[PDB]
Amino acid sequence: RNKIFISHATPDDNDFTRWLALKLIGLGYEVWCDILFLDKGVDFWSNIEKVIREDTCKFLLVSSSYSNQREGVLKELAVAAKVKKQLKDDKFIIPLAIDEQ
Amino acid sequence: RNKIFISHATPDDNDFTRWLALKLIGLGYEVWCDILFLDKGVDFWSNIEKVIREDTCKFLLVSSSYSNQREGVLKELAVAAKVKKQLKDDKFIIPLAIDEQLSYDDINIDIVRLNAIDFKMSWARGLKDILEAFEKQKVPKEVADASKSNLLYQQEIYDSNWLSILSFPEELRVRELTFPAVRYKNYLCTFIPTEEILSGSYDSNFIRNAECKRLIVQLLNKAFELRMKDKEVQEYEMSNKTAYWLEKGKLEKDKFEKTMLVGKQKDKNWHFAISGASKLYPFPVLMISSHIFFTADGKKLIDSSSVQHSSRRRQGKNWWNNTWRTKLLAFIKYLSDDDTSFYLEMGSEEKVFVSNEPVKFKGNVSYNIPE
Amino acid sequence: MKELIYIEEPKILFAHGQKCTDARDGLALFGPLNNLYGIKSGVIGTKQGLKIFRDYLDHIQKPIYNSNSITRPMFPGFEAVFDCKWESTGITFKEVTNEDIGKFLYNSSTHKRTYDLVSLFIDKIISANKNEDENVDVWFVIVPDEIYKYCRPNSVLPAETYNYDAQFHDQFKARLLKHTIPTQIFRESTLAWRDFKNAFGLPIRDFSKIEGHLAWTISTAAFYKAGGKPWKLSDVRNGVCYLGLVYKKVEKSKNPRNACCAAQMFLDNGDGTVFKGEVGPWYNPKNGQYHLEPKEAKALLSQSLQSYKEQIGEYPKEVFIHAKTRFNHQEWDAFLEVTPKETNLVGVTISKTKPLKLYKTEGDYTILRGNAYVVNERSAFLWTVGYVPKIQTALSMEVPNPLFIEINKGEADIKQVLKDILSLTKLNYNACIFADGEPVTLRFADKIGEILTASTDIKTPPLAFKYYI
Amino acid sequence: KFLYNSSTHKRTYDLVSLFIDKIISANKNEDENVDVWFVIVPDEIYKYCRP
DNA sequence: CTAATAGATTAGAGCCGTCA
């Protein structure tokens, strides 16, 4: 349970998300996101859940106009909220803000 | 798209699944189940996918410790999620919780954001949960049955007859003499303070407290007998007790305060009668019992208990709570003396006063009276 | 102004572990507890009775409907409810010619004719049980209406035969006790209720709108007498044994004397309910004395305690002795010296004599069924008959009478006493009703005593109710 | 406690009673409808109960 | 022991209603 999970909209936030993920990896933090991580030929919806439930210490969320309405990010946020309630951790979710409109 | 798909783990959850499928079929819906409609010798994954994709309106999932993390269930869930996305119905998937051993923090990642239904407490409760949801979401109900499926869908202050005794004569201190008198030893008992007799206090080798209470009760009963003799009310001798009733024409049109105490039944009249017994437990009261007696021409009774019993059975068949209550209260108010009481002559001056309204009880629970 | 408390409904348990307050709804929706495979029926009677019984068996295979469904639920057919088979193909018939019934019913003496008729009917059953290979679960007796009206205590027609009561039913049930054969007596007019009429072209008994009720009752009785379990009590406190005492006068035995018969109920290991009789009458020569001598009471308590200990292994923590009379010191002191020290004896008197009636102000229906007026810490009134909201009607006509409960010996909480009495009214297997008026510990202990006093002494009679009701 | 008397007659009587009393009790005072009764006799009971 | 006056208890029998 020592992996940073990055949720975001796709393919609209891949540039910023890739920048952030590469920077975090370079600084030494284990991160996760579809690009560079999801395996081809796997049950994804059911691997979006295992990693969130068993291999996550923090839950970053890239917020923008694209996010906060996408179904996938909302599902991931709901599972993250449930995991936070279970863990009794106050700062499980970190809502990054990158937009202004 | 009018088939309710049911996803479960086979054969661990077969009992509940079969029960639910049979219930939903009985109510009128169309159900597809892995154990009741799959064919023998058919390509089953392809048929299941076709059923999920082409004809399916609801996807009821049986959620338990077995159905969680099962390959078939998960593949069906994935295809159903695709169909939900394509169909723009946010309530296409509905988990059903039936296992008490499955914690809400361990459910699939595909159903975390979904409102499950609880069958853990009772299966009928969950059944009506799902029926309410179906009514709201307007799932097509193929109602091909009448008077059977709808029947499967369908499947305070009180009065009393106690008259409290308001007062007693102060001191206690042959049945054919004017006042109530009782023989006892060489003495005579008739109206020791009575406040202490009715407290379990007085005791002596002359008389015991229980015997004294019995004698007081006997005096009260004799006084009531004489008092009703002095009211000019006709009497009927029952098997052990006596009853009193009013002659036809005695009341103004056989009515006292918008209540009728004498009426008609075929070739007979019917008369409302009462009898009284005085008791000291649990508190001094005068218990009243209701009876109906039938007279041939309205004045003379019938010297036959068989016909009396049959007619009494016929008359009470239509009476109900309000009829009995009002008739009893009206008779008591008729016997009332001045405003709220009614005395029994216990001697030259002494009197026993009886209330003319019954004891009132109160509760906290009733019924809505659904007509 | 006085105060009334209300007592919640007990609930009973059915298949799948489901609960409900109405027996009919539970049997319809979930079904019985245990699983029989089928009922094989033995019929004894004439050919008319055989035809009538076959027709009725065929009648109740399909769903039957009542006029008012809310008051009385529908009957969905025998097998839909009970998950077993009871058809007119498992019938084994033993004919009884009409000449015999005519010729024996001619002595003008009630005792001789009753004895002869009972012997005629029971000898065939005894032979069919001894000398034959076929298997019979419940024997069904179909008596013509003409013999029923003449075999009654006071009956007039318009040799160890004087030692029995002159009632067909009691003597018939008693004389089969030593062979342990279940039986169900019917009347020809009970099954063929249409064919028996009066001066007008109507049946004497009209079952047109209550036919599903009759189907429910007959089916439940037949399913219980075949060794079935249609429901049970959901909540019964552990370590509590309930008894019941009733006195039946043993008429015309060398003097006026009277006996005593009992019943018992408790929860055993495995969440089972052991509702069974307590047999062996205990007498006293005195006339009109409804009590026990110390010697005859020590035996009864020892028997009951030994039975409970044998089935459970430890003595009851609580024993409640319900009765319709009042105990005295001489016999209650016989108690408490056979009882252990780790057990509580409580004697409850239940009577329906005190005339209290409660009426609603500005209404038309009666009082609820849970209401109780607590007079004291040793006395209270309980309404076991009244308006039930579920069936939208009351269980009686006119205004019901309350049931007067009085703690007589020992100390107990009256609210708990009422709670335990109210749940004892849901176990009437002779009936298919919402609930009874009095506890069945006092009603089933009465049938056994009524059947045991209509015959000569019989050693070690059966305890199971299926041989009595 | 029964198949030890060393007298064939008495132990045969006792064992027959032990089985038949239960069978008859079940027959007379229970609510089932049993078509046949199947008696599973351990080998020792049958072995020595011969004449 | 016998025969009456009552209050407070008990157990038996027999008849009627169940809907609209």
Ligand SMILES: NC(=O)c1ccc[n+]([C@H]2O[C@H](COP(=O)([O-])OP(=O)(O)OC[C@@H]3O[C@H](n4cnc5c(N)ncnc54)[C@@H](O)[C@H]3O)[C@H](O)[C@H]2O)c1
């Ligand atoms: N953890 C992350 O970094 C992250 C970010 C966004 C979404 N997600 C997840 O959410 C997604 C679903 O939400 P959405 O509809 O907004 O996503 P989406 O926009 O990626 O899905 C819509 C389309 O489906 C395509 N698609 C479908 N199945 C695919 C597969 N197996 N591999 C690659 N592309 C596939 C996507 O490429 C896209 O074109 C996917 O399940 C998964 O990628 C994860």
Ligand SMILES: NC(=O)c1ccc[n+]([C@H]2O[C@H](COP(=O)([O-])OP(=O)(O)OC[C@@H]3O[C@H](n4cnc5c(N)ncnc54)[C@@H](O)[C@H]3O)[C@H](O)[C@H]2O)c1
């Ligand atoms: N309730 C469920 O678990 C469920 C529901 C729908 C589909 N499925 C699918 O998943 C199942 C997995 O079964 P399992 O391997 O765990 O156990 P299994 O095959 O021993 O038992 C499962 C049952 O076997 C039967 N079955 C399987 N293959 C069959 C075939 N080729 N021909 C005929 N009958 C066949 C089906 O009735 C299936 O439900 C079956 O492959 C298929 O029905 C399961």
Ligand SMILES: [Mg+2]
């Ligand atoms: Mg019966």
